[PDB]
Amino acid sequence: RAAGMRLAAQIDSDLISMVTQRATNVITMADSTAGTQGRDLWNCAAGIDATMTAIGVPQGINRRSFWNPFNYKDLAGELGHRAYAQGATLTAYEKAQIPPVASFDSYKTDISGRLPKGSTESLTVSGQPEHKVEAKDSNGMPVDNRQGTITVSASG
Amino acid sequence: HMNIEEGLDLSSKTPTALVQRLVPSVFKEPKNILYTLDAREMRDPEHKTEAGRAAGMRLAAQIDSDLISMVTQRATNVITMADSTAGTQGRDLWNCAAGIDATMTAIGVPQGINRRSFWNPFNYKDLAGELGHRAYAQGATLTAYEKAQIPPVASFDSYKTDISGRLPKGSTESLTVSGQPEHKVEAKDSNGMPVDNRQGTITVSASGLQVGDAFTIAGVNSVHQITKDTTGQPQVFRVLAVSGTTVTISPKILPVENTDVASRPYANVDAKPAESAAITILNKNAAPANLFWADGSVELMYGKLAFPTGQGPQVMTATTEQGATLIMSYAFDHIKGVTTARFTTLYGCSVLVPEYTGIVIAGQ
Amino acid sequence: PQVMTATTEQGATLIMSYAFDHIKGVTTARFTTLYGCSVLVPEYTGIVIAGQ
Amino acid sequence: ANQLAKDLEIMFENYVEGFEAACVVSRNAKKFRPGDTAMQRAGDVLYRPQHY
């Protein structure tokens, strides 16, 4: 019983850390000193869908969002502390559950991925880099067109 | 709990040692009330009537007071807030209660099991003061305004407790952990008795800590109890006993990559303390706790002493409002001219999973 | 060894196998799984971080 | 009377409550079963085309 569930939970941890490292749309917010928490997270979630739309990701295809328990709580706090204490407000206040957010279905994930503390160095792109598309490399192996290489001035 | 191992060939890898951990639950010393009436005093039957009434309710109330003290001292998830000078009191408490459930979820407490919250009357009032002053004066708002009652809060059923546990005023000293304490997990000790894995012992650089303190160690964060991935939140430790610089704490400091291989599956935290790691005491001011649990961790076990009828004293039983047995015994000494009355009960209160429980303290 | 198959919550395959060594009287037991996780189109995915 | 016998009350399958992982992200991911013979010949990698 213990072995079966510990393996299942590792599949989730590996997927969450994979998606966290590879996702190319990123939006960040400072943690709000005002009441604007939850509104700021909704602006970020809606900014992800606006970005997906603007780059041409299909508008009809289904959409999912997985929130860490702390930011799911921040959205539930905003929606539950609204003036009309009925329906979705009352559900968010009483049971901390939220509706879909900004076109995404909303899920609370118990495990979550993390980004490292980024360098405080004033880095710059060295040279003037421009990649090309290739079907295969100089040895005839396939080329992963999702990624390329650059020089940056100071290695931070 | 089990280790994960990497690759196809495992001929170089130690199998996970099974550790059959056991947690004790134990009855306390019996709880009693004694009174006596002499043969003059027994001429007025109200004394037995009123003293029996008073004794029965005083033992019922002690079962509640012992359990509340027990849960307040053992609960490992702890969140603090200053009292708001702005209007944000009550909103900040909802954010703290939801922060307890967010923390329970992040460490891997099941999300589907039922949850209870027990608010002291002041912080229950602070929540009702937010919900009652919403701009749509109807339904839950109107109940919160008129009668100061609240619905469930932040996924917990909400209860108001008249009695509540108080955390002490924590030390102002710059305490640090001495050495780099790292506990092991054991099924049983050197005498073959089961080991209580909920407690461990540390050395601290000066004798400032107190029983019932809540504190965090500078470099030490909780992990999800199954995957062992970090929560990024500090682990809170509870002080359970003190002896000079030597302090008993809960939970055990069990790192991921513990020096003891057999206890690595049972890790609570991302790392052991660094050398001289700072202690931050959370209870800066003494404050009434608000108690939270997920069901199945917090228990009352009831006993009954074998007091015999039909020999010597006359013996009877009653049930407290919590289902505990009271035994009432009356015995008359005709040489002293006195009746002695004994009311007695036997119980234990226990927190089987200190992680299924948490507390919020306001007033910082 | 004895070999058996089960399925995780996500539909992943578990192989369980047990080998008894009768002259020393022990069973070694192994659970194992094989999987990969991928983002085929990075642009179809995004992340939000608070605390800047 | 003095000197009564004592034992241990251990309740060997009455477990205290314990942690879990909800697996929610990997339960919502798309799942794929490539052929195991093909994955062996390929060295556990496969490729899919993108649109023109």
XYZ file of C-alpha atoms in Angstrom:
624
model
C 0.000 0.000 0.000
C 2.786 2.435 0.968
C 4.919 1.557 -2.105
C 2.024 1.896 -4.606
C 1.053 5.400 -3.418
C 4.687 6.647 -3.066
C 5.336 5.789 -6.745
C 2.052 7.434 -7.850
C 2.964 10.614 -5.912
C 6.422 10.756 -7.622
C 4.753 10.852 -11.081
C 2.850 13.967 -9.924
C 6.023 15.596 -8.485
C 7.999 14.951 -11.691
C 5.194 16.322 -13.903
C 4.719 19.458 -11.726
C 8.476 20.198 -11.765
C 8.636 19.532 -15.568
C 5.746 21.962 -16.366
C 7.225 24.549 -13.940
C 10.629 24.491 -15.726
C 9.343 24.390 -19.359
C 6.316 26.762 -19.479
C 7.187 29.849 -21.619
C 4.312 32.211 -20.684
C 5.254 33.727 -17.253
C 3.563 36.536 -15.282
C 4.771 37.810 -11.880
C 3.303 40.026 -9.152
C 4.624 41.604 -5.960
C 2.674 40.389 -2.894
C 0.060 43.091 -2.196
C 0.311 45.404 0.851
C -3.159 46.762 -0.113
C -6.410 44.731 -0.459
C -5.507 43.926 -4.139
C -4.421 40.306 -3.504
C -6.727 37.881 -5.388
C -7.536 40.706 -7.896
C -3.811 40.760 -8.783
C -3.768 36.925 -9.122
C -6.898 37.108 -11.331
C -5.144 39.801 -13.451
C -2.202 37.383 -13.822
C -4.406 34.362 -14.736
C -6.395 36.480 -17.231
C -3.020 37.811 -18.538
C -1.920 34.191 -19.229
C -5.100 33.545 -21.290
C -4.769 36.931 -23.064
C -1.129 36.012 -23.915
C -2.101 32.505 -25.133
C -4.810 34.138 -27.300
C -2.503 36.865 -28.680
C 0.144 34.278 -29.793
C -2.633 32.209 -31.493
C -3.364 29.315 -29.067
C -6.927 28.189 -30.077
C -9.723 29.917 -28.123
C -12.098 26.895 -28.183
C -9.798 24.315 -26.504
C -10.291 23.548 -22.809
C -8.075 25.197 -20.153
C -6.850 24.157 -16.669
C -5.194 26.016 -13.767
C -3.440 24.437 -10.772
C -2.943 26.761 -7.818
C -0.682 26.181 -4.821
C -2.725 26.093 -1.566
C -1.621 29.609 -0.496
C -2.575 31.423 -3.735
C -5.796 29.363 -4.059
C -6.563 30.693 -0.532
C -5.772 34.277 -1.713
C -8.367 33.999 -4.557
C -10.920 32.401 -2.193
C -10.333 35.209 0.346
C -10.956 37.903 -2.300
C -14.123 36.241 -3.692
C -15.515 35.383 -0.202
C -15.053 38.874 1.340
C -17.329 40.553 -1.286
C -20.398 42.598 -0.270
C -23.153 40.172 -1.393
C -22.665 37.241 1.056
C -24.595 34.683 -1.098
C -23.870 32.088 -3.854
C -20.218 32.006 -5.028
C -19.222 34.590 -2.330
C -20.703 32.450 0.436
C -19.085 29.249 -0.927
C -15.706 31.018 -1.116
C -16.135 32.358 2.465
C -17.452 29.165 4.092
C -15.529 26.426 2.271
C -12.681 28.318 0.520
C -13.597 26.772 -2.900
C -13.450 29.026 -6.015
C -15.291 28.878 -9.395
C -13.376 28.682 -12.715
C -10.942 31.649 -12.964
C -10.425 33.773 -16.091
C -11.522 30.913 -18.485
C -9.449 28.214 -16.713
C -10.935 25.424 -14.663
C -9.449 25.857 -11.163
C -7.750 23.108 -9.120
C -5.843 23.236 -5.790
C -2.532 21.311 -6.003
C -1.067 20.098 -2.659
C 2.436 19.716 -4.097
C 3.701 22.726 -6.148
C 6.805 23.612 -8.207
C 9.224 26.479 -7.379
C 11.435 28.929 -9.284
C 14.897 29.668 -7.760
C 15.914 33.104 -6.433
C 17.026 34.863 -9.643
C 20.366 36.725 -9.806
C 20.505 40.448 -8.872
C 23.308 41.058 -11.462
C 22.657 43.516 -14.348
C 23.102 40.920 -17.135
C 23.006 41.563 -20.920
C 22.745 39.353 -24.040
C 26.214 39.153 -25.667
C 26.532 39.213 -29.477
C 23.243 39.698 -31.376
C 21.693 36.224 -31.344
C 19.322 34.896 -33.982
C 18.426 31.211 -34.265
C 17.268 29.189 -37.312
C 14.828 26.292 -37.809
C 16.296 22.882 -38.776
C 14.785 19.420 -39.413
C 18.137 17.695 -38.553
C 21.648 18.633 -37.348
C 25.073 18.264 -39.067
C 25.209 14.594 -37.848
C 21.631 13.921 -39.156
C 19.895 13.624 -35.726
C 16.608 15.561 -35.131
C 16.898 19.120 -33.696
C 14.590 20.214 -30.834
C 13.247 23.529 -32.213
C 11.695 24.401 -28.768
C 15.153 25.541 -27.487
C 18.406 27.289 -28.576
C 21.668 28.750 -27.149
C 22.919 32.323 -26.383
C 25.858 34.054 -24.633
C 25.182 36.339 -21.617
C 27.830 38.752 -20.358
C 28.469 37.583 -16.731
C 27.068 34.017 -15.995
C 24.471 34.916 -13.261
C 6.632 5.347 4.338
C 9.063 4.059 1.638
C 12.216 5.310 -0.189
C 12.318 5.866 -3.993
C 15.216 4.299 -5.953
C 16.481 5.203 -9.449
C 17.336 3.029 -12.484
C 17.028 -0.579 -13.712
C 19.899 -2.268 -11.769
C 19.306 -1.927 -7.986
C 21.991 -4.449 -6.838
C 23.904 -1.536 -5.151
C 20.813 -0.155 -3.269
C 19.742 -0.906 0.334
C 16.023 -1.930 0.605
C 13.828 0.387 2.719
C 13.825 -0.805 6.345
C 10.216 -1.208 7.520
C 9.697 0.690 10.827
C 6.552 -0.251 12.753
C 6.055 3.076 14.565
C 3.527 3.058 17.437
C 1.946 6.076 19.238
C 0.863 5.715 22.907
C -2.512 6.709 24.324
C -2.741 6.630 28.134
C -5.245 7.337 30.942
C -4.372 10.218 33.325
C -4.426 9.880 37.129
C -8.129 9.664 38.206
C -9.918 13.032 38.622
C -11.962 13.386 41.814
C -13.978 15.756 43.984
C -14.254 15.153 47.761
C -16.646 16.770 50.247
C -17.824 15.810 53.770
C -20.961 16.550 55.824
C -21.268 15.857 59.568
C -24.455 14.485 61.212
C -25.525 18.077 62.132
C -24.894 19.404 58.584
C -26.812 16.478 56.994
C -30.035 17.776 58.698
C -30.313 20.207 55.732
C -30.573 18.128 52.472
C -29.718 21.058 50.137
C -25.977 20.690 50.945
C -25.739 17.203 49.361
C -28.012 18.329 46.489
C -26.013 21.494 45.647
C -22.549 19.946 46.268
C -23.475 16.943 44.062
C -24.704 19.312 41.296
C -21.520 21.406 41.590
C -19.222 18.323 41.614
C -20.861 16.739 38.530
C -20.494 19.877 36.361
C -16.944 20.663 37.654
C -15.613 17.257 36.460
C -17.358 17.598 33.062
C -15.744 21.039 32.659
C -12.286 19.619 33.589
C -12.438 17.033 30.737
C -12.992 19.973 28.349
C -10.226 22.088 29.976
C -7.693 19.207 29.843
C -8.474 18.476 26.167
C -8.255 22.189 25.210
C -4.892 22.478 27.042
C -3.669 19.250 25.338
C -4.619 20.367 21.770
C -3.213 23.907 22.373
C 0.159 22.465 23.527
C 0.539 19.664 20.884
C -0.737 21.319 17.665
C 2.153 21.695 15.160
C 0.714 24.039 12.478
C 0.791 27.598 13.991
C -0.029 30.980 12.403
C 0.225 34.428 14.048
C -1.126 37.907 13.269
C -0.933 41.330 14.909
C -4.317 42.853 15.828
C -5.304 45.182 12.975
C -5.400 48.958 13.590
C -7.222 49.266 10.226
C -10.597 47.537 9.523
C -8.824 44.255 8.513
C -9.374 42.330 11.798
C -11.681 39.345 11.016
C -10.467 39.343 7.373
C -6.930 38.676 8.664
C -8.375 35.886 10.913
C -10.169 34.272 7.931
C -6.840 34.493 6.059
C -5.157 32.796 9.086
C -7.760 29.972 9.326
C -7.482 29.389 5.565
C -3.664 29.525 6.078
C -3.970 26.599 8.544
C -5.885 24.523 5.944
C -3.470 25.605 3.174
C -0.593 24.389 5.424
C -2.395 21.106 6.277
C -2.958 20.580 2.517
C 0.674 21.440 1.622
C 2.061 18.872 4.150
C -0.342 16.198 2.734
C -3.219 16.003 5.268
C -6.180 14.576 3.218
C -8.336 17.339 1.648
C -11.673 15.432 1.837
C -11.794 14.692 5.607
C -14.036 16.870 7.792
C -12.575 19.905 9.625
C -13.479 21.826 12.822
C -12.491 25.241 14.217
C -12.955 26.402 17.826
C -12.722 30.160 18.252
C -12.265 32.031 21.521
C -15.163 34.506 22.073
C -13.067 37.569 21.096
C -11.879 36.240 17.720
C -15.290 34.652 16.992
C -16.639 38.217 17.562
C -13.953 39.630 15.196
C -15.189 37.301 12.385
C -18.865 38.149 13.069
C -17.893 41.860 13.026
C -16.500 41.522 9.473
C -19.374 39.399 8.092
C -22.087 41.481 9.855
C -20.819 44.784 8.369
C -20.978 43.659 4.686
C -22.850 46.202 2.558
C -25.702 43.777 1.623
C -27.603 43.567 4.962
C -29.356 40.180 4.355
C -29.031 36.446 5.265
C -25.573 35.546 6.661
C -24.710 39.292 6.993
C -27.890 39.977 8.954
C -27.383 36.960 11.288
C -23.766 38.055 11.869
C -24.905 41.634 12.683
C -27.939 40.842 14.861
C -26.779 37.767 16.820
C -22.983 37.680 16.242
C -23.131 34.102 14.775
C -20.989 33.028 11.760
C -21.401 30.205 9.179
C -18.462 27.772 8.537
C -15.135 29.571 7.872
C -12.312 28.729 5.461
C -13.424 25.006 5.102
C -13.794 24.495 8.884
C -17.055 24.069 10.739
C -17.100 27.014 13.180
C -17.671 26.688 16.936
C -17.339 29.274 19.736
C -15.537 27.966 22.847
C -16.009 29.878 26.139
C -12.860 28.304 27.603
C -9.673 28.472 25.430
C -5.937 27.662 25.837
C -3.398 30.542 26.179
C 0.174 30.470 24.823
C 2.791 32.073 27.158
C 4.666 35.338 26.545
C 7.735 34.068 24.647
C 11.326 35.061 25.552
C 12.910 38.235 24.066
C 16.393 36.554 23.995
C 18.370 35.776 20.785
C 18.221 31.973 21.215
C 19.990 29.550 18.844
C 20.030 25.762 18.384
C 23.327 24.199 19.602
C 24.896 21.513 17.384
C 22.885 20.392 14.311
C 20.159 18.203 15.856
C 18.810 15.436 13.657
C 16.540 12.810 15.200
C 16.202 9.139 14.117
C 12.995 7.041 13.925
C 12.761 3.849 16.023
C 9.969 1.298 16.585
C 11.157 0.433 20.151
C 13.900 1.471 22.606
C 16.888 -0.349 24.217
C 14.439 -1.896 26.778
C 12.115 -3.080 23.938
C 9.297 -0.603 24.812
C 7.637 1.319 21.928
C 9.109 4.781 21.115
C 6.855 7.853 20.752
C 8.068 9.346 17.435
C 6.016 12.598 17.984
C 8.664 14.020 20.411
C 12.432 14.672 20.281
C 15.094 16.550 22.304
C 17.428 19.446 21.337
C 20.050 21.662 23.026
C 19.608 25.468 22.814
C 22.265 28.103 23.629
C 20.423 29.660 26.655
C 17.473 28.607 28.903
C 14.811 31.016 27.495
C 12.152 28.613 26.033
C 8.964 27.635 27.977
C 6.432 24.762 27.826
C 3.743 25.628 25.238
C 6.034 27.896 23.117
C 5.785 27.775 19.327
C 9.008 28.500 17.395
C 10.739 28.150 13.998
C 14.416 27.361 13.249
C 16.109 29.601 10.638
C 16.866 27.104 7.790
C 14.137 24.448 8.365
C 11.010 24.120 6.142
C 8.138 21.594 6.137
C 7.849 19.033 3.288
C 4.889 17.203 1.724
C 4.740 14.063 3.888
C 4.554 11.667 0.871
C 6.689 13.215 -1.946
C 9.113 14.994 0.462
C 9.048 18.126 -1.764
C 9.451 21.403 0.202
C 6.442 23.568 1.128
C 8.782 26.621 1.302
C 7.187 27.474 4.714
C 9.176 27.191 8.010
C 8.430 24.147 10.202
C 6.939 25.148 13.577
C 8.132 23.254 16.668
C 6.244 23.099 20.014
C 8.087 23.010 23.367
C 6.748 20.123 25.507
C 9.362 20.037 28.346
C 12.424 22.069 29.525
C 15.578 21.249 31.568
C 18.164 24.079 31.511
C 19.550 24.249 27.915
C 17.938 20.842 27.036
C 14.442 21.101 25.493
C 11.879 18.508 24.328
C 10.059 19.498 21.136
C 7.405 18.251 18.688
C 7.590 17.090 15.905
C 11.013 15.363 15.638
C 13.605 17.081 13.387
C 13.600 14.419 10.623
C 15.402 15.748 7.495
C 15.194 14.620 3.917
C 18.643 12.946 3.564
C 18.847 12.269 7.341
C 22.213 10.691 8.406
C 20.117 7.730 9.661
C 19.061 5.961 6.406
C 16.158 4.010 7.998
C 14.332 7.257 9.008
C 14.633 9.060 5.593
C 11.110 7.860 4.530
C 9.741 9.590 7.685
C 11.224 13.060 6.939
C 9.246 16.122 8.219
C 11.633 18.849 6.972
C 13.889 19.799 4.046
C 17.162 19.995 6.088
C 18.626 19.758 9.629
C 19.482 23.106 11.352
C 22.706 24.873 10.346
C 25.373 25.375 13.060
C 24.083 27.943 15.646
C 20.773 28.373 13.702
C 18.512 31.150 15.079
C 15.257 30.357 16.942
C 12.277 32.658 16.203
C 9.579 32.414 18.923
C 6.130 32.965 17.365
C 4.165 33.730 20.578
C 5.781 37.209 21.150
C 2.768 38.149 23.360
C 0.520 35.877 25.462
C -2.782 35.309 23.562
C -5.879 33.014 23.557
C -5.503 30.352 20.845
C -8.118 29.429 18.243
C -8.000 25.636 17.634
C -8.278 23.839 14.269
C -8.334 20.144 13.390
C -9.001 17.681 10.629
C -11.069 14.832 12.164
C -9.621 11.557 13.544
C -6.470 12.981 15.234
C -7.959 14.385 18.480
C -9.422 11.880 20.935
C -10.849 11.329 24.423
C -10.485 7.783 25.792
C -12.744 6.896 28.744
C -12.202 4.402 31.573
C -14.115 3.230 34.671
C -12.591 2.235 38.037
C -13.980 -1.016 39.532
C -15.839 0.498 42.552
C -18.018 -2.361 43.956
C -21.678 -2.036 45.035
C -23.119 -3.958 48.032
C -19.980 -3.822 50.258
C -19.017 -0.847 52.486
C -19.956 2.501 50.720
C -23.047 3.008 48.548
C -21.996 3.498 44.896
C -23.792 5.007 41.858
C -22.877 6.166 38.320
C -23.770 9.085 36.050
C -22.620 10.149 32.538
C -21.071 13.604 31.830
C -22.364 15.599 28.825
C -19.276 14.311 26.879
C -20.111 10.624 27.618
C -17.517 10.115 30.417
C -18.521 7.920 33.410
C -18.830 9.584 36.819
C -18.809 7.318 39.882
C -20.486 8.783 43.009
C -19.657 7.049 46.332
C -21.072 7.858 49.789
C -19.773 6.379 53.066
C -20.882 7.193 56.651
C -18.509 6.799 59.633
C -20.832 6.517 62.676
C -17.939 7.038 65.176
C -16.789 10.313 63.500
C -20.433 11.183 62.674
C -19.497 12.159 59.062
C -20.444 11.219 55.510
C -17.636 11.363 52.955
C -18.719 11.859 49.334
C -16.409 10.978 46.404
C -17.137 11.933 42.799
C -14.570 10.356 40.412
C -13.840 9.852 36.687
C -11.044 8.286 34.565
C -10.024 9.502 31.079
C -7.149 10.332 28.733
C -6.955 13.053 26.061
C -4.558 12.580 23.104
C -3.486 14.095 19.761
C -2.612 11.061 17.628
C -1.462 13.139 14.608
C -0.122 16.582 15.693
C -0.058 17.589 11.948
C -3.883 17.185 11.654
C -4.162 20.064 14.190
C -3.259 23.767 14.186
C -3.736 27.039 16.093
C -4.135 30.738 15.222
C -3.054 33.400 17.747
C -3.987 37.062 17.246
C -2.321 39.984 19.145
C 1.041 38.785 17.661
C 10.324 -14.201 -9.237
C 6.560 -13.845 -9.022
C 5.532 -10.869 -11.238
C 2.263 -8.883 -11.048
C 0.817 -5.698 -12.590
C -1.271 -2.854 -11.097
C -2.334 0.691 -12.176
C -1.757 4.021 -10.315
C -4.336 6.815 -9.764
C -3.055 8.422 -13.033
C -3.271 5.190 -15.117
C 0.515 4.473 -14.909
C 1.711 0.829 -14.801
C 3.144 -0.610 -11.567
C 5.084 -3.878 -11.768
C 5.338 -5.720 -8.426
C 7.775 -8.638 -8.158
C 8.767 -10.950 -5.292
C 11.775 -13.331 -5.127
C 12.025 -15.966 -2.351
C 15.539 -17.257 -1.482
C 14.750 -20.495 0.365
C 18.222 -21.377 1.831
C 18.352 -18.037 3.769
C 14.549 -17.752 4.034
C 13.953 -14.188 2.703
C 11.671 -12.584 0.119
C 13.032 -9.493 -1.594
C 10.201 -7.360 -3.003
C 10.353 -4.711 -5.770
C 7.794 -2.208 -7.051
C 8.723 -0.392 -10.296
C 7.312 2.013 -12.917
C 8.483 3.653 -16.182
C 7.183 7.024 -17.441
C 8.064 10.330 -19.102
C 6.524 13.779 -18.672
C 6.696 16.439 -21.406
C 5.459 19.848 -22.539
C 5.034 19.323 -26.283
C 4.065 22.987 -26.905
C 5.562 25.366 -24.271
C 3.344 28.225 -25.608
C 0.175 26.278 -24.581
C 1.340 26.541 -20.919
C 2.080 29.316 -18.439
C 2.925 30.047 -14.808
C 2.110 32.768 -12.252
C 4.352 33.588 -9.240
C 3.467 35.934 -6.350
C 6.122 37.601 -4.099
C 7.779 38.849 -7.363
C -2.755 -8.003 45.707
C 0.894 -7.226 44.818
C 2.815 -8.617 41.777
C 0.161 -8.834 39.016
C 1.244 -9.609 35.413
C 1.329 -6.751 32.820
C 1.457 -6.894 28.989
C 1.288 -4.502 25.969
C -2.002 -3.505 24.304
C -0.842 -2.985 20.687
C -3.707 -2.641 18.169
C -1.785 -4.013 15.156
C -4.128 -2.886 12.291
C -5.948 0.094 13.934
C -3.747 2.702 12.195
C -3.791 6.342 13.272
C -4.740 8.692 10.404
C -2.054 9.310 7.740
C -1.013 11.612 4.899
C -1.716 11.302 1.147
C -0.907 12.944 -2.204
C -3.975 14.093 -4.220
C -2.144 13.568 -7.604
C -4.444 16.217 -9.203
C -2.084 17.671 -11.880
C -0.979 14.264 -13.231
C -4.614 13.011 -13.067
C -5.543 15.962 -15.377
C -2.578 15.597 -17.812
C -3.037 13.888 -21.221
C -1.889 10.202 -21.074
C -0.071 8.297 -23.850
C 0.942 4.582 -24.328
C 3.701 4.289 -26.993
C 4.611 0.696 -28.029
C 7.206 -0.902 -25.699
C 9.027 -2.737 -28.556
C 9.264 0.573 -30.468
C 10.512 2.470 -27.374
C 13.178 -0.229 -26.830
C 14.461 -0.002 -30.459
C 14.382 3.820 -30.235
C 16.263 3.966 -26.868
C 13.262 5.336 -24.859
C 12.829 8.532 -27.020
C 10.201 9.305 -29.672
C 9.524 12.298 -31.917
C 6.317 13.971 -33.186
C 6.068 16.498 -36.068
C 4.958 20.122 -35.806
C 2.707 21.849 -38.391
C 4.044 23.777 -41.415
